[PDB]
Amino acid sequence: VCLFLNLANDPTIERIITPRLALTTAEFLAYQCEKHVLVILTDMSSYAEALREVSAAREEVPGRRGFPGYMYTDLATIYERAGRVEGRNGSITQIPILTMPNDDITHPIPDLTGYITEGQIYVDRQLHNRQIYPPINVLPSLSRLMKSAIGEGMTRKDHADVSNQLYACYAIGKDVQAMKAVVGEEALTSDDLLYLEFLQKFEKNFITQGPYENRTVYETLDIGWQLLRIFPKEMLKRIPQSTLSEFYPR
Amino acid sequence: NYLSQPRLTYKTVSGVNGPLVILDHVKFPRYAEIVHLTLPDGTKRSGQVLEVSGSKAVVQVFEGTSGIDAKKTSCEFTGDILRTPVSEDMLGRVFNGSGKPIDRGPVVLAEDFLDIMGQPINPQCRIYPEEMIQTGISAIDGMNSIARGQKIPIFSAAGLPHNEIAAQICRQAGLVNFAIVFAAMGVNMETARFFKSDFEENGSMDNVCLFLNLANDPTIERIITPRLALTTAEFLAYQCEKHVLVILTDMSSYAEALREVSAAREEVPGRRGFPGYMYTDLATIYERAGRVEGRNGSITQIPILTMPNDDITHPIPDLTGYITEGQIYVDRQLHNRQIYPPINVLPSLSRLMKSAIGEGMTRKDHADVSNQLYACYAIGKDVQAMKAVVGEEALTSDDLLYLEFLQKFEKNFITQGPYENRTVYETLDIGWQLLRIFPKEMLKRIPQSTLSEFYPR
Amino acid sequence: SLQTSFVTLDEAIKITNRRVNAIEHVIIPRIERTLAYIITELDEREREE
Amino acid sequence: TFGYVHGVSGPVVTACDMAGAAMYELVRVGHSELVGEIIRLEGDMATIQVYEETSGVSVGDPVLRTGKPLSVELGPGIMGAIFDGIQRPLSDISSQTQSIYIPRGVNVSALSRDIKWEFIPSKNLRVGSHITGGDIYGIVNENSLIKHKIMLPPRSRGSVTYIAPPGNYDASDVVLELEFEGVKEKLSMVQVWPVRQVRPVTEKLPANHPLLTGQRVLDALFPCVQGGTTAIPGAFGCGKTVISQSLSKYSNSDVIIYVGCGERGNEMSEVLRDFPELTMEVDGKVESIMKRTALVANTSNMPVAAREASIYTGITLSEYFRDMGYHVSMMADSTSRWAEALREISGRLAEMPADSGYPAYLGARLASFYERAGRVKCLGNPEREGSVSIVGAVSPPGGDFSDPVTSATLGIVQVFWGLDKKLAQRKHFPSVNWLISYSKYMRALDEYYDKHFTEFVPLRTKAKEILQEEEDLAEIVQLVGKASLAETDKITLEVAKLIKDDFLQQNGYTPYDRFCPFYKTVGMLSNMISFYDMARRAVETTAQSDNKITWSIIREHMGEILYKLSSMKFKDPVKDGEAKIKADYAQLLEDMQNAFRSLE
Amino acid sequence: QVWPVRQVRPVTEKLPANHPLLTGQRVLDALFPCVQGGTTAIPGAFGCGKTVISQSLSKYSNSDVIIYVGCGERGNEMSEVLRDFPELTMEVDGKVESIMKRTALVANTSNMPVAAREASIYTGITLSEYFRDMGYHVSMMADSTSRWAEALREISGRLAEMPADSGYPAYLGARLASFYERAGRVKCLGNPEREGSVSIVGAVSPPGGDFSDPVTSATLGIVQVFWGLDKKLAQRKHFPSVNWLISYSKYMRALDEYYDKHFTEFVPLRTKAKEILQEEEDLAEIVQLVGKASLAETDKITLEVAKLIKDDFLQQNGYTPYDRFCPFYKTVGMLSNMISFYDMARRAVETTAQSDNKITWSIIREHMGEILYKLSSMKFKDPVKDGEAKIKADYAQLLEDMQNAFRSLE
Numbered sequence A: 001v002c003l004f005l006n007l008a009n010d011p012t013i014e015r016i017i018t019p020r021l022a023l024t025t026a027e028f029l030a031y032q033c034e035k036h037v038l039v040i041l042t043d044m045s046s047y048a049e050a051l052r053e054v055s056a057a058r059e060e061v062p063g064r065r066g067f068p069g070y071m072y073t074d075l076a077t078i079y080e081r082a083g084r085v086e087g088r089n090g091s092i093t094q095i096p097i098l099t100m101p102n103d104d105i106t107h108p109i110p111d112l113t114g115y116i117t118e119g120q121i122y123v124d125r126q127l128h129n130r131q132i133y134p135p136i137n138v139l140p141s142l143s144r145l146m147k148s149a150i151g152e153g154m155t156r157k158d159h160a161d162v163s164n165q166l167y168a169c170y171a172i173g174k175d176v177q178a179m180k181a182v183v184g185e186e187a188l189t190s191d192d193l194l195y196l197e198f199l200q201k202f203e204k205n206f207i208t209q210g211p212y213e214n215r216t217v218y219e220t221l222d223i224g225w226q227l228l229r230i231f232p233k234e235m236l237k238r239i240p241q242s243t244l245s246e247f248y249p250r
Numbered sequence B: 001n002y003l004s005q006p007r008l009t010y011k012t013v014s015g016v017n018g019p020l021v022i023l024d025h026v027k028f029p030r031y032a033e034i035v036h037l038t039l040p041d042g043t044k045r046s047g048q049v050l051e052v053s054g055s056k057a058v059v060q061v062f063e064g065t066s067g068i069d070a071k072k073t074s075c076e077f078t079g080d081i082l083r084t085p086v087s088e089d090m091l092g093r094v095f096n097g098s099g100k101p102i103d104r105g106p107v108v109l110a111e112d113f114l115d116i117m118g119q120p121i122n123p124q125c126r127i128y129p130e131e132m133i134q135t136g137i138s139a140i141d142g143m144n145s146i147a148r149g150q151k152i153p154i155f156s157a158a159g160l161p162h163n164e165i166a167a168q169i170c171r172q173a174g175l176v177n178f179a180i181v182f183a184a185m186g187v188n189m190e191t192a193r194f195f196k197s198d199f200e201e202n203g204s205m206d207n208v209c210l211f212l213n214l215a216n217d218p219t220i221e222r223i224i225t226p227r228l229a230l231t232t233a234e235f236l237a238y239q240c241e242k243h244v245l246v247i248l249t250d251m252s253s254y255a256e257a258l259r260e261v262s263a264a265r266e267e268v269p270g271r272r273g274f275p276g277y278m279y280t281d282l283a284t285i286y287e288r289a290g291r292v293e294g295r296n297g298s299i300t301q302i303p304i305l306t307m308p309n310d311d312i313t314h315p316i317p318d319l320t321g322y323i324t325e326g327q328i329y330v331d332r333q334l335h336n337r338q339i340y341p342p343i344n345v346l347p348s349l350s351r352l353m354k355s356a357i358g359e360g361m362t363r364k365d366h367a368d369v370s371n372q373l374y375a376c377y378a379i380g381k382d383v384q385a386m387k388a389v390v391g392e393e394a395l396t397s398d399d400l401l402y403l404e405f406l407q408k409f410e411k412n413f414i415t416q417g418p419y420e421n422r423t424v425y426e427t428l429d430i431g432w433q434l435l436r437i438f439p440k441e442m443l444k445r446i447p448q449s450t451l452s453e454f455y456p457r
Numbered sequence C: 001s002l003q004t005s006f007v008t009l010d011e012a013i014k015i016t017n018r019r020v021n022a023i024e025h026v027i028i029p030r031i032e033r034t035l036a037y038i039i040t041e042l043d044e045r046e047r048e049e
Numbered sequence D: 001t002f003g004y005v006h007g008v009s010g011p012v013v014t015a016c017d018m019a020g021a022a023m024y025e026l027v028r029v030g031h032s033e034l035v036g037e038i039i040r041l042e043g044d045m046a047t048i049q050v051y052e053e054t055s056g057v058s059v060g061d062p063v064l065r066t067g068k069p070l071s072v073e074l075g076p077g078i079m080g081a082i083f084d085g086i087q088r089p090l091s092d093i094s095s096q097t098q099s100i101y102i103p104r105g106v107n108v109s110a111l112s113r114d115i116k117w118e119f120i121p122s123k124n125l126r127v128g129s130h131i132t133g134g135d136i137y138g139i140v141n142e143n144s145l146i147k148h149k150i151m152l153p154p155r156s157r158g159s160v161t162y163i164a165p166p167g168n169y170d171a172s173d174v175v176l177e178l179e180f181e182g183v184k185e186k187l188s189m190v191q192v193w194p195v196r197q198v199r200p201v202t203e204k205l206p207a208n209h210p211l212l213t214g215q216r217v218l219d220a221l222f223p224c225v226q227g228g229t230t231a232i233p234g235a236f237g238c239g240k241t242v243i244s245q246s247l248s249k250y251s252n253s254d255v256i257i258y259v260g261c262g263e264r265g266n267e268m269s270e271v272l273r274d275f276p277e278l279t280m281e282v283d284g285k286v287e288s289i290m291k292r293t294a295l296v297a298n299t300s301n302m303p304v305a306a307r308e309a310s311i312y313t314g315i316t317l318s319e320y321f322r323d324m325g326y327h328v329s330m331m332a333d334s335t336s337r338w339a340e341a342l343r344e345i346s347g348r349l350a351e352m353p354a355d356s357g358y359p360a361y362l363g364a365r366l367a368s369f370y371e372r373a374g375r376v377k378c379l380g381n382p383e384r385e386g387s388v389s390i391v392g393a394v395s396p397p398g399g400d401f402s403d404p405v406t407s408a409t410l411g412i413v414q415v416f417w418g419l420d421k422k423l424a425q426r427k428h429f430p431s432v433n434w435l436i437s438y439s440k441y442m443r444a445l446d447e448y449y450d451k452h453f454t455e456f457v458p459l460r461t462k463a464k465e466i467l468q469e470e471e472d473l474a475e476i477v478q479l480v481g482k483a484s485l486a487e488t489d490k491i492t493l494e495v496a497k498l499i500k501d502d503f504l505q506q507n508g509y510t511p512y513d514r515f516c517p518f519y520k521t522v523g524m525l526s527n528m529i530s531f532y533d534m535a536r537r538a539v540e541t542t543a544q545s546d547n548k549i550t551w552s553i554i555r556e557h558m559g560e561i562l563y564k565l566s567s568m569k570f571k572d573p574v575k576d577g578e579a580k581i582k583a584d585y586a587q588l589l590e591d592m593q594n595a596f597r598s599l600e
Numbered sequence E: 001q002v003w004p005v006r007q008v009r010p011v012t013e014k015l016p017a018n019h020p021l022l023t024g025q026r027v028l029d030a031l032f033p034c035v036q037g038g039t040t041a042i043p044g045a046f047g048c049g050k051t052v053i054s055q056s057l058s059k060y061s062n063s064d065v066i067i068y069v070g071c072g073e074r075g076n077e078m079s080e081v082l083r084d085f086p087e088l089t090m091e092v093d094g095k096v097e098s099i100m101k102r103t104a105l106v107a108n109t110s111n112m113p114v115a116a117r118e119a120s121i122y123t124g125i126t127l128s129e130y131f132r133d134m135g136y137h138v139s140m141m142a143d144s145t146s147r148w149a150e151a152l153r154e155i156s157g158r159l160a161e162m163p164a165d166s167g168y169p170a171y172l173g174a175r176l177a178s179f180y181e182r183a184g185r186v187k188c189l190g191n192p193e194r195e196g197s198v199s200i201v202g203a204v205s206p207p208g209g210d211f212s213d214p215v216t217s218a219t220l221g222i223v224q225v226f227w228g229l230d231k232k233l234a235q236r237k238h239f240p241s242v243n244w245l246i247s248y249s250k251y252m253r254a255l256d257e258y259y260d261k262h263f264t265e266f267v268p269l270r271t272k273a274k275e276i277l278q279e280e281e282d283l284a285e286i287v288q289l290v291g292k293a294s295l296a297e298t299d300k301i302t303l304e305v306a307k308l309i310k311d312d313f314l315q316q317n318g319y320t321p322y323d324r325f326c327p328f329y330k331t332v333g334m335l336s337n338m339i340s341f342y343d344m345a346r347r348a349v350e351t352t353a354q355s356d357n358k359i360t361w362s363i364i365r366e367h368m369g370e371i372l373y374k375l376s377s378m379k380f381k382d383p384v385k386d387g388e389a390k391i392k393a394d395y396a397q398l399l400e401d402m403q404n405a406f407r408s409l410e
């Protein structure tokens, strides 16, 4: 591994170099030395604030919240520096990390990032307050390439179908959880109570990992089915009946 | 030593923009010196140098720039900052915004000249104010008590009787000699007469000085109006040992002059477009208060401010909130029900009450009573909010007792005559005869010793 | 029959009125203050710009 | 002497050779004499905000400085005139041009020259007499109802060197000459004043007399004082015309001014068409209200400066009439549209937005405008009092009072006559919502009422309480029905309905309610409340009895009194003498007392 | 010696933080602990109590010295410190001594010239780093970093620089970041080995009382501890006004080793406390739409022990002789009794609701009203009058009284 450190008490402007420097090390190791590289950027917000500081000092015309208007192209020259290339085995995976200012997903730093990065993983105050570690809110979390990374020979063939069903169930779960207040628990149907039971069991088992449990994809889909098994077979409208007949009666 | 050197006078006006006039060719401009302007028609105005740069002096003109001219305007630079003539002879007199006399008396003879900005009281010499003033008003003296030399504002919604409350304080306030500085900014004449008349009705007029700036007087003079008042209050208190009370009326109509000057200068805007220095400017007013070592004087400040759209979180109340020793709140929810004075105890606090009460200042029970009255009043509002959704059938007998507490409390503890003076002891006894509505053990803020000495009576 | 109706109505009317009053004194007030706050902070962004 | 245009950007014209100019000095720009105000000096250069469209202004065009800031000509010929906000006579710009438009570049003098008037010099004066600002050195008989008192300008003083003899004169005639410090000043019946400067006074007084509108709800429950400051929520659905017409066509106010701030083009023409057709009785003659007013009308498309000046011209005209010793009253049709003109001029000045978009100074401009009201001792020597009453309409979006102009206006005004669309939909004219409405002048009229109507403060207090009790009781009526209320509550509700429908409400198209005198108003309410107290006496006096009185028994045995109480509105100040009306009301008091005695 | 205040005084190492910054306040020391060498913020609106927390830490903590930094603060605060601190006393080695001997004040009152707020904050930390290098566990009360940020707004405004949010300079986040991160527990410079520390507590003062404030927004990205104060608690005179839903401490994972060594029972209690205090708000959003009759007996017990933990544990009147301070033994004893009541009451319902002989919260209250009153009374125990063994013995008697009462219900 190779760590570039800039601490909060290191000068602001060094943070402009820091991610580009790291990515240049990543491109050397991957595209010239065939390494599979994982690049972790620890807080693109403290980078964006460094562009803001110098941009402000330059009297540049601002984008929203006083960042430089070039923030999008600038972030693109960082984020786009990833992925396998022709004739190389080498490949860079980037997992940049980004402190959402004031918890706001629509803040310009995460907003412009979401346009460039191929999805996001969203970590939520609500789940953290509930002691759900890791606090990953699966709903706003997205991965644009995921559909191409799954299927027979890549994974168990159920993976895509199980994910879509589980995701829609969690969403309906959050809706019926709001209904438990707005219309009351007594207004919930048996099916809404099953989506509420699903929501609880899902956070307790699907999301909650512990700090060292290296669950396989296969074990994750087994847990996926063990949660889907809560509903009657006919409720699982996102899964094809062939996949249900192979993996629901387990 | 006196400033002996002869004064310059410039026709070199080289620009005018908003309330600013920009001189050029000025010989060693001084930041914050005062300039007198003569207009082409012979009208006199005054102004402060806001910026200097080489030959340029940017003067802000107090009496407005309308009629200033790029050829004929004459600027007499005074060569010093805005000093004010002060004397104890200013008691029993009335002044315009800029401290010119308007009671038809003569110009003030200076016992000295003082800098209008005052000076930062040395934190080492400052004495922590603790000797209680009874205002006579139960909602103050009981639950929000004011120390001799405290600063504590009265916040109000618009049109609330806050003038009558301040008048009552200037009719009943005293310790368990005294003199008043009063200032009003952007006040209407229909209220200027009320204040002047009230100091006559109370017989107090001989011991009070009124600085009046009315809503049709110049807005920039409001910036200096409370500073003149405080400079006179410093002279009376720290130089002459008077137990001064300073009333500053509609700090909002002062704050609007800050917002205007800010927009006119293009200063960096904080919340709602007040200047970034808004907190400091308010401090430069509000910190001239409290006792200082060796001096028996004690400037107390009771600013008054109309909160815009009744919003407690507005920058005027909110920044005042961070600076003042707690705040007294006046409420429409009381005033519409005719509950005079409409002081809502709950949102109120006094930072100095902690040491202004208990043995040697007030009866031993007082601090415990105050806290338990907040507890019961607050729980009363919470059960009222419950009743307003789910009805009295959802409330327990204890919840209905907290609702009854809030009703009996507002009708007796807060409700008081505009000329009725209640001692702290009488206020505490009203407090206890209300607290006796609950069983002894329910009074969870009060220690068992205080309950044994004061609950059964 | 009239009594069973009476009892059921006396609960259902109370439940309904409680929801109505919760909308009128909880949910609408949260929405109104939230809208007034949003209008304020949008105008703060507009003044900064 | 005059300068030359140097540059133009939109409505903002930079000029040069402006060395002797002043900020806010008025300037004519271009060969067409466009009007504008200087808004910056930069040395010998100056920047002029032009009012009219600058299209076709050229570099090197003439820039004539006017010797004055923005100003109002004051004198004879104001009455019946229609001006715009910058004091240009819209009736004459019509008739002299023969055009439907205001031509870009008007130069018509605001008080029309060559029109003679009958001038009487004040016969008490002589050459060598001492004179000061506000001294009435003569009168112009310009209309039968309003003797126009001429006066020395407030800045002027000295010894009379010559005064014109009695005769016919106009603005070009030197009516007066006086000398001070060895310098003669020539003067005319026309006077000029800076529009943004208050006209000074000997003393501004506490206001203490009712501005009687002839409208029961207003004059009883929410009295505005003469010289008072007041607001009306001017919106289409609530009938804002009802108050403004009634004030003009009857109320105790010697001269009316009406300012169109910036009204919708049709709604402005509605007013300008309609007001000339209104008439008021004077000395047993009927005459057009155009004898007692001037209209400062601005449609929304009049220049931004003409809208923001509109109210300042209006108040300046009103203060000139105040200093003649008249009780002037001035409407403003929408202070909100004036506040938009403030937002726009501050936008063009590139000043920072304060509240919601408005300037920092919006509150101060409103407050320093409303303070121009009040009763006053005039300047000069004949010692007369006068006043200006300001009736400033507001138009809060959706009725939301948090709107900056509305909020600041309700902060400053002492009376709010809250008109309501609900009451207008129910045809409850004058449609004033008595729960929302208020007056802070109640205390100030105690002295007046104690002298002239010593019982009336008790009556007003009881009336508001009775109506407020009915509003609380209506919640109980919804919860448990009218049948469930106590007898005292039921009679209170019935009487509150009687007060609401037959005292608050008033049909201003009928001969009996077209106006309603104050003595009539008091007598009507006195009867309703005397009935309430005696009815309530019989009810409460028969608490715990075998037979208990109720409103139904009162309606059965004496419903003729309820019918008579409702009928008391029909009494006519023209066909019935004041003593006859008072006698009929006293007869109803005797009738009801004997009727109540038949029960208790 | 003389040192540039803007240059960090260097160290041999910055270590992890692993000893609690003991503070007089129950809610702080129990539920959101600060650590010697850790940063903290106290964002609160005006009159919320943040300044009294700042006083309380200075008056009563295990800090070996305190630098207090009155940056832009009201002048009577400095007078109150200078009045109280020469008269309040700690003890060392059997000698009672005035706590002023372990402090220094940097003052710059709100009306003193704006610029000096910057120099004040840097002076307070540079003094703190000096005492840190001596091996003292320093603490430093940055008594308002928003009034500091407002001084950076002022200079930026005069310089005509481009502002970020609410007029603040873009470098505000960078200045604050490079300030709070001057804290730590350190192997000092030089040869005789020392473990000094600076702990930094910043009383952020959000304009309008709203945590969307840029000073707060930056500060929360830097500090490892958030004690967010609620104005609604301060209105009710609930103090210290810490909102237990939004507040957090990142140091719990390091401190858990200290609690395991000295207070092994505590981590269960802290967990049950936080959970009950969350379940109250989960219930409130239901109760406000239907009324309290909807609650199960478990929920009534939850709200009651939440009311105990709120009104008799979290509440603390820090000027009174009994709430002046609170030792950890008193703190855990109070919380242990309250949670012991929760578990026993919950167990009693769960044990009997399987039958017609069901125990209820009302049955418990009517049989055990004296126990609820004793539980409320626990706060009044006074460390000056009562020894740790005496307070613990009273608390053991409450545990026994509860157990014998519940044994009579079951």
Ligand SMILES: Nc1ncnc2c1ncn2[C@@H]1O[C@H](COP(=O)(O)OP(=O)(O)O)[C@@H](O)[C@H]1O
Pocket (backbone or CB within 6 Å): B321, B322, B349, B350, B351, B352, B354, E044, E045, E046, E047, E048, E049, E050, E051, E052, E053, E239, E240, E241, E316, E317, E318, E319
């Ligand atoms: N812990 C407390 N114990 C008792 N009273 C408190 C406590 N915290 C706040 N109050 C009261 O409220 C006042 C306001 O809080 P303080 O910290 O002094 O002001 P601020 O929040 O503006 O900094 C305190 O001075 C005290 O009188």
